[PDB]
Amino acid sequence: TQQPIVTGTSVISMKYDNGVIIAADNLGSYGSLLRFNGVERLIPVGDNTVVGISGDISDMQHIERLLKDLVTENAYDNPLADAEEALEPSYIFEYLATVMYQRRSKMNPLWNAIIVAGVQSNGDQFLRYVNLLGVTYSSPTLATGFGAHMANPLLRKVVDRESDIPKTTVQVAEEAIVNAMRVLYYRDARSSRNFSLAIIDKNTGLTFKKNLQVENMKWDFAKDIKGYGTQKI
Amino acid sequence: DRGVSTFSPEGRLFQVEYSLEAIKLGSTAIGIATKEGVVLGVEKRATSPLLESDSIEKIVEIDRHIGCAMSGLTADARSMIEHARTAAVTHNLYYDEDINVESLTQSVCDLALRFGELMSRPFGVALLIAGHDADDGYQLFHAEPSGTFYRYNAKAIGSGSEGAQAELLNEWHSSLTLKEAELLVLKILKQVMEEKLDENNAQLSCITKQDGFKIYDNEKTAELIKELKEKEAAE
Amino acid sequence: MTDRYSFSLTTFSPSGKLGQIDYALTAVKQGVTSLGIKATNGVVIATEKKSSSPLAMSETLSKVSLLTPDIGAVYSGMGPDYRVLVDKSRKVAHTSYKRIYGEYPPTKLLVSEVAKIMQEATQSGGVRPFGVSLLIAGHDEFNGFSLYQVDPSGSYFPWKATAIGKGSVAAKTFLEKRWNDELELEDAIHIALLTLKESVEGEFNGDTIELAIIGDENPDLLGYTGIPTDKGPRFRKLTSQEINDRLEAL
Amino acid sequence: QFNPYGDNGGTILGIAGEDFAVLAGDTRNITDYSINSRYEPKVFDCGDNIVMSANGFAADGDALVKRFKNSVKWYHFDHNDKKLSINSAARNIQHLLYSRRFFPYYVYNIIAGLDEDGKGAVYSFDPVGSYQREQCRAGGAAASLIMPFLDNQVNFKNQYEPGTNGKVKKPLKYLSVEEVIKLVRDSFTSATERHIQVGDGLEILIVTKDGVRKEFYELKRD
Amino acid sequence: NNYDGDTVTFSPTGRLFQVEYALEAIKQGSVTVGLRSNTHAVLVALKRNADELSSYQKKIIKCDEHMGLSLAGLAPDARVLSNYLRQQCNYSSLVFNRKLAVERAGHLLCDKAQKNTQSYGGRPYGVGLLIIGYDKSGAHLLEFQPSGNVTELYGTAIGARSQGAKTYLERTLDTFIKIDGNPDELIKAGVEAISQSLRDESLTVDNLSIAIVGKDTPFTIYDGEAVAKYI
Amino acid sequence: GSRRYDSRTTIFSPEGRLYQVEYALESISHAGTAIGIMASDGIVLAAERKVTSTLLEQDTSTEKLYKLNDKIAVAVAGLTADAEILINTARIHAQNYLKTYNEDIPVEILVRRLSDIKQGYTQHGGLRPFGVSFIYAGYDDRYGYQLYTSNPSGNYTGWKAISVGANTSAAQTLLQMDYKDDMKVDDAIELALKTLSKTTDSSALTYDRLEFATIRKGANDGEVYQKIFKPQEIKDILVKTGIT
Amino acid sequence: TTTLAFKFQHGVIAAVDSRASAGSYISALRMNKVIEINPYLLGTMSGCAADCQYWERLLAKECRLYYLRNGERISVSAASKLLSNMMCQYRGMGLSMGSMICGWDKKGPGLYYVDEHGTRLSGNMFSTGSGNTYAYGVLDSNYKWDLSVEDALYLGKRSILAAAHRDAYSGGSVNLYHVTEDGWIYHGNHDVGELFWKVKEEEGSFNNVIG
Amino acid sequence: GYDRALSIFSPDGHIFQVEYALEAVKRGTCAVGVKGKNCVVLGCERRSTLKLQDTRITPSKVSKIDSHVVLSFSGLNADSRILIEKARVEAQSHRLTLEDPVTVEYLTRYVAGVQQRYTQSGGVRPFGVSTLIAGFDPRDDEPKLYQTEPSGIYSSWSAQTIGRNSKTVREFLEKNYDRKEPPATVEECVKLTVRSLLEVVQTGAKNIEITVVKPDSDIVALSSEEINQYVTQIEQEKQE
Ligand SMILES: [Mg+2]
């Protein structure tokens, strides 16, 4: 049993017609202190999977190394490591999900909430969640922490059920994700303006976007707000 | 000296081959499987007339639906029987059902090759495991110290085995009754035994679906011996 | 891996002999002569510093070793076996005695502990016996001065005087003629030097002879003052000069 | 302090017919006041004509089901591809559960299938291993809302025959699969109205001698 | 001679006699044949009985839905190794939601057998295995020797008189590899192959054992009247 | 591997004997003779030190007679180092018993314990046995004065008089000749020394070649005293009995 | 819960209720609180049903293995002890079990109470559960050794009814068992609701309740 | 740990270590067991090569395992103590877990199992001991007599002997012991046991030990004089 120290907030994601999108801000908070501003919390595994992690950063760095070791180990005595026997999103997820549940069963968890996003060999979209308890679930939209409360409602307006996925384009999905990140910046006290976004498409592959910023913000209406009730000046 | 788990140049384990020689010195045990039941019979072979022969226990119950006869170093069989009885009852605990005769036999045979430098040597005893289950009906198995088990329609083990097996080769057919099998075991036992066969130096048993495994009374066997004598004198 | 020699390497032969112990005693016989003489007010132990090469610094090789402040040891036989026994003897004096009773063990009990270690190498699995005989000299309050021999078997005997190794038979005869129960420490040292000269071929001086004594308390060697009851070690190794001084009166 | 347990909500329902059996459960997965998924299957086909649902803490439920499916696989290997009877599966699960008596699988489990005489069967478990065969059993969040209804409409409890005035009970006539499914749907529709953790969708698995069949129905998404 | 007392001893020419003696046990064992096309992989095994009252010793063992093997030599050793494969196949499924590659299964068997050849006290395995399987890279056939050597092949045979079947497959190589989408014809080629190793005895209904795995075919064993079709 | 070098210390001969036990007994037959004689009013322990030297410090020396507790003592024949291992174990056992029951350990119970330890080395472990034979002299309030012997096999027996070590055949005959049941300690002392004097391989029996002990109720009133004889006291008893 | 068992002239009676609760919510109307260890042995259930089921089914294993080894049926005294000894291993770990072991052996009919504490008492009459006090009252005032099988069965049945009525956590149905030297005999499941009204009328009892 | 396989099969299918353990039993002093109608008698030879022995304290040949069961043996004395200790511990363990004392058959089965275990465990040698185990089951008046041997086999006997010259005394028992009418009294049973030992013993003085075990934990060892009276009466009838 522990307590998280350096933490990473919401990770948000959704499925669209040809793939998945996932995003997460570049902040490593130390309680209320916004300590580290250059933290990458989206970690690609090969060219078909991106693992987004929230929660304890030291545990995230540990998981990051497990995945890096997983890639090395898969290549061992494997002539088809860059082909038919390459790592799949479903393999990577199940491995993590096994680890998370085992760690909680020893009462020494990895204090994280993880979303594995990717595209399978057959072109199917993969999006599944797992956390420190070893709890798993899948949905057209997935988000951790605050994203679960604020982002999902917005993303579910685009893809409310499974049948909406083919109707949703990458431009619409990316737009919804980018809007959600802005909303989280407005309303999550432990968020940052800077974030990373990754798209895994079954045709165009993995597109990893770094150094993104929340833009087109509305603040001007603040000038008119005065006092807390009766004050006019 | 040499390893206990050593292979010979011919590709056989020395210790397993040697334990087979010990089984050849054991008293005769015969099993005959029929569609009405499986019969198990043994030569008691008391070393002295003062030895109370009913204390010689070479036929043993494993479960209500499985019996077992032994030949060779019979002291080695006790831990095998204990394991068999535990396996049978444990499976009933886990699965609320009788265990398959083959599965029971396989569980016993798993112990066989667990020797090296685990126990220090193979078992010096062969087992005839007879039983009944719903899936494969009446079954007779021969469990060896090699870890191999063959299913048999009829099988003899011990000192008079090759002579008895040749006799079982001729006598067995797929339409044998239980009564016919009983007399057949008695006949072949009487043939290969040194001393004259009677109810005190030979024992019968059987396994049926209805009544399960039963060791025969000396009074019951004595009547079957008298029935045998008369039918052999009949021609 | 794993030490798979869990069986005895020393075993009784049909004649009742323990071969490996006998052979260990043979190795001791080949070893350089060492001796011990007990006086009324002290004990002396001595041996030859048989230098393997003139380029070797024989001062760095200590055949006579301090075990406790009041106990010293010397050997004949295999040097490396002796060195590790001294390490164990020093430690056992602390672990099985000083850390319990707050004082150093008496000679006979430290000898008993060393003997036990040597006995175990004679019976335990996958080891040979130690190829040394030890002469342990010491002093304690209630037993006074004492001298013990310890053999590869683990057997130990108290001596008035004795010798072990190369010329032990001749040396023991020499000691029998010279020893009495009224010897002073200086007389014992003189007899030790005389006895030791017979077994030495080449150079015979302070640089080729190693000699120590168990005698009076040495407060100058204690290293501190202020505690009356602490009066300093009784063990003292004689210097090269101190030996040569007594070789002129030889 | 770390709490190894959690509550993913959900409600399940098993009913045993005369020659069939159903195991139903909602498809909603939740934590606290949030929805994780509107469709996260909870009832599984484990093989050998057995269906299973471990309701409660999803992680322990997924682990138990995973283990049982594995126990079926090894039963085949070890016992010459023999079919695992529903009663044998039940006893096996007891031992899977009790292996964690001192750190339980926080789930209330139900399995359904057919007995060795071809009749419908449902077995109900508690988190620590006790089990027993039943005719009707609702488990999970809204179990307390559903079970009284089933006592009334399945076993005809408190129902007497008109004219006799409590002297003659309503006879226990067997129900058809279509009749049972109606009671299941109405059970979950009612539960969805008054229980916040119940909703989104209903998945039912029907077990007959012909095999396992699935039926899905929408539920309110609020 | 003086160097065959245990597995831990090289001979002066660099041989390991205990391993060679274990190899000999395979030669005494009953013949079994393996072969594959691009869609299916087939095992064919000649089972051996003790006498006329006895059953015919089973030769083929299922390891997973997509993998299994046939044995020749000490049957209990095959049970140990097949149990290990079952566990490894199962570990891959449970942890990685991934079917175990046949090539990787061969690597695992090689390493398990190797440990028994370099350590004191143990003995080499006294059995040879022919592993067939269908994974993400199609059909596969492996030959396992208890020396540790595992080899991927189009076809092969092990056991007594296996050389006859092996020569046949070497001639038929170009034909049977092309038998795609036709399980019955691939089995025929295997039954014809194993027939080149028979003397005095012929293939009867309780003598013959066949297994198959392929694209849309789980590993299934055929015994009894199920193989009468191919006799 | 290692098997090659294994002597196999714990195996039967074709005749059903334990090789190492038999060879250990052969070793013990060359050890100095030890004798125990039980009388109505006490026990005597007498033992011969092996070919000693004039430079050996006898008054501080102990190779034959050892004290296990205040009521029980042993005479040793064989490897002294082996004996001391067993002796220290026996001393601990006596104290364990005293701590547990708050009563002095009965003689047989101690003897059985040591004999069981010896037995273990002959049946398991693959180690050589202890090349030691003990004579136990002791007293308790159940059986009074008791003599026992144990050998490397782990077999023990009770005795009125007994010898171990060298020339036991000759010694046992002499004891069997002159021993009587109504004998007293002072008579037993004389018998023991006379027997050693006749069986010894040395030219003459002297004080410096002997260890001697008595267990007497010759302690003031109902209690038992152990007396390990000093060199001068052994010299006096030799003159008293008329040997020197 | 309510369970009782008593010894009498012609064997031992064993009676139990059938209710199970999760707080105020009744989780089970029909729960078997008797364990059929074997044809000659019965075990009641009190506390954790899991622990009762597991350990008593494990006892059955041991009792069967006993018979196979010794070729003789195990005694009630020995069986009860094996069970108490299992409890003593998990002493302090949190098991919850209260069971009467009922049977017939050489010494005649036998009855032993065993709990998670390891305790093991012999006796002619026992009752456990939240409603045992109500049951004891009926038992103590009507129990004789000279009882007939018919009257004894009714007594155990009536004693559970008394508890089922007053105790909130007891009820559902009554399960009866009669243990003879030829084995145990099940005497059915009796709905309390139906039994109450029936007994009220025939017996005249429960006057305060309106029917 | 020392794991060496000492008990192993030879080419002819013999375990020599187990067979050599029987040779140790052949060397041991003769022990005999005879069961009457309402008793069992255990006779034991004491070799008279050892005089000056203290018979009060010397380990007796017959040992009580419980108040109702006894054990005598032939072979290595030190080995027998280990079996006796184990048996005594098991006897109390049985009373503690099952609440009944052991049956004679159960106790025999346990001791025989220990002996067997030592014939196929690594690093150990077989017990050089054969035992005679006698007594009466709790609340039973039927006499019980069993025999065990190093291999671990055991069996029930009307009368049996083990140890040196056991071939001779078995010869005597086989012609003198009638199964249809066993020694009806304690006298007849003891007389037959002493007679059987007199075929082998040498002098009938302190060389013969007799222990009578009767039902309900009634066990007594006969003294020298009591046995001497049997020895006297036997030879006086023989002078004819
Ligand atoms: Mg709702």
Swiss-Prot record, chain D:
Recorded hits in InterPro entries, A to Z, give: Ntn_hydrolases_N, Proteasome_bsu_CS, Proteasome_sua/b, Proteasome_suB-type
Keywords per UniProt: Cytoplasm, Nucleus, Proteasome
The biological processes this protein is annotated with in GO are: proteasomal ubiquitin-independent protein catabolic process; proteasome-mediated ubiquitin-dependent protein catabolic process
Q: List the GO cellular component terms.
A: cytosol; nucleus; proteasome complex; proteasome core complex, beta-subunit complex
Is Nucleus found in the keyword set? Answer: yes
* CDD domains linked: proteasome_beta_type_1
Its function, per the record, reads: Non-catalytic component of the proteasome which degrades poly-ubiquitinated proteins in the cytoplasm and in the nucleus. It is essential for the regulated turnover of proteins and for the removal of misfolded proteins. The proteasome is a multicatalytic proteinase complex that is characterized by its ability to cleave peptides with Arg, Phe, Tyr, Leu, and Glu adjacent to the leaving group at neutral or slightly basic pH. It has an ATP-dependent proteolytic activity.
Family (UniProt) = Belongs to the peptidase T1B family.
What is the name attached to this protein's record? Proteasome subunit beta type-6
Name the species this protein comes from.
Saccharomyces cerevisiae (strain ATCC 204508 / S288c)
| Gene that encodes it | PRE7
Curated annotation (Swiss-Prot), chain E:
Q: Which GO terms describe its biological process?
A: proteasomal ubiquitin-independent protein catabolic process; proteasome-mediated ubiquitin-dependent protein catabolic process
| Presence of keyword Cell cycle | no
Checking Gene3D superfamilies in the record gives: Glutamine Phosphoribosylpyrophosphate, subunit 1, domain 1
SMART domains the UniProt entry points to: Proteasome_A_N
Would you say which domain of life the source belongs to? Eukaryota
Q: Which UniProt keywords apply?
A: Cytoplasm, Isopeptide bond, Nucleus, Phosphoprotein, Proteasome, Ubl conjugation
> Per the record, what is one GO cellular component?
proteasome complex
Identify the Pfam families for this entry: Proteasome, Proteasome_A_N
General function of this protein: The proteasome degrades poly-ubiquitinated proteins in the cytoplasm and in the nucleus. It is essential for the regulated turnover of proteins and for the removal of misfolded proteins. The proteasome is a multicatalytic proteinase complex that is characterized by its ability to cleave peptides with Arg, Phe, Tyr, Leu, and Glu adjacent to the leaving group at neutral or slightly basic pH. It has an ATP-dependent proteolytic activity.
Q: What else is known?
A: Present with 7210 molecules/cell in log phase SD medium.
- Provide the family line: Belongs to the peptidase T1A family.
Q: What protein name is recorded for this chain?
A: Proteasome subunit alpha type-6
Organism lineage string: Eukaryota, Fungi, Dikarya, Ascomycota, Saccharomycotina
Task: From the UniProt record, report the name of the gene that encodes this protein.
Answer: PRE5
From Swiss-Prot, chain F:
> Please, one GO biological process term?
proteasome core complex assembly
Which Gene3D superfamilies did the record assign? Glutamine Phosphoribosylpyrophosphate, subunit 1, domain 1
Please state where this protein is localized. Answer: Cytoplasm; Nucleus
Q: Where is this cross-link: Glycyl lysine isopeptide (Lys-Gly) (interchain with G-Cter in ubiquitin)?
A: 99, 198, 230
- Superkingdom of origin: Eukaryota
Q: Which residues cross the membrane?
A: none
- Record's Gene Ontology CC terms? cytosol; nucleus; proteasome complex; proteasome core complex, alpha-subunit complex; proteasome storage granule
Instruction: Kindly give the PROSITE patterns that the UniProt entry links to this protein.
Output: PROTEASOME_ALPHA_1, PROTEASOME_ALPHA_2
Instruction: Give the UniProt keywords, A-Z.
Output: Cytoplasm, Isopeptide bond, Nucleus, Proteasome, Ubl conjugation
Question: What does this protein's UniProt record list under function?
Answer: The proteasome degrades poly-ubiquitinated proteins in the cytoplasm and in the nucleus. It is essential for the regulated turnover of proteins and for the removal of misfolded proteins. The proteasome is a multicatalytic proteinase complex that is characterized by its ability to cleave peptides with Arg, Phe, Tyr, Leu, and Glu adjacent to the leaving group at neutral or slightly basic pH. It has an ATP-dependent proteolytic activity.
Additional notes on this entry: Present with 17100 molecules/cell in log phase SD medium.
Q: Which family does it belong to?
A: Belongs to the peptidase T1A family.
- Official protein name in the record: Proteasome subunit alpha type-3
Organism, as annotated: Saccharomyces cerevisiae (strain ATCC 204508 / S288c)
Curated annotation (Swiss-Prot), chain H:
Q: How does it assemble?
A: The 26S proteasome consists of a 20S proteasome core and two 19S regulatory subunits. The 20S proteasome core is composed of 28 subunits that are arranged in four stacked rings, resulting in a barrel-shaped structure. The two end rings are each formed by seven alpha subunits, and the two central rings are each formed by seven beta subunits. The catalytic chamber with the active sites is on the inside of the barrel. Interacts with CIC1.
Which GO BP terms, alphabetically? proteasomal ubiquitin-independent protein catabolic process; proteasome-mediated ubiquitin-dependent protein catabolic process
Task: State any GO CC term.
Answer: proteasome complex
Q: Which residues carry this modification: Phosphothreonine?
A: 58
Q: Which gene encodes it?
A: PRE6
Additional observations: Present with 16800 molecules/cell in log phase SD medium.
Q: Provide the taxonomic classification.
A: Eukaryota, Fungi, Dikarya, Ascomycota, Saccharomycotina
Kindly indicate whether the keyword Phosphoprotein belongs to this entry.
yes
- Chief place of localization: cytoplasm
Family to which this protein belongs: Belongs to the peptidase T1A family.
Spans through the membrane: none
Compartments where located: Cytoplasm; Nucleus
Q: SUPFAM superfamilies, per this entry?
A: N-terminal nucleophile aminohydrolases (Ntn hydrolases)
Q: What is this protein called?
A: Proteasome subunit alpha type-4
Keywords for the protein's UniProt record, in alphabetical order: Cytoplasm, Nucleus, Phosphoprotein, Proteasome
Look up and give the organism this protein is from: Saccharomyces cerevisiae (strain ATCC 204508 / S288c)
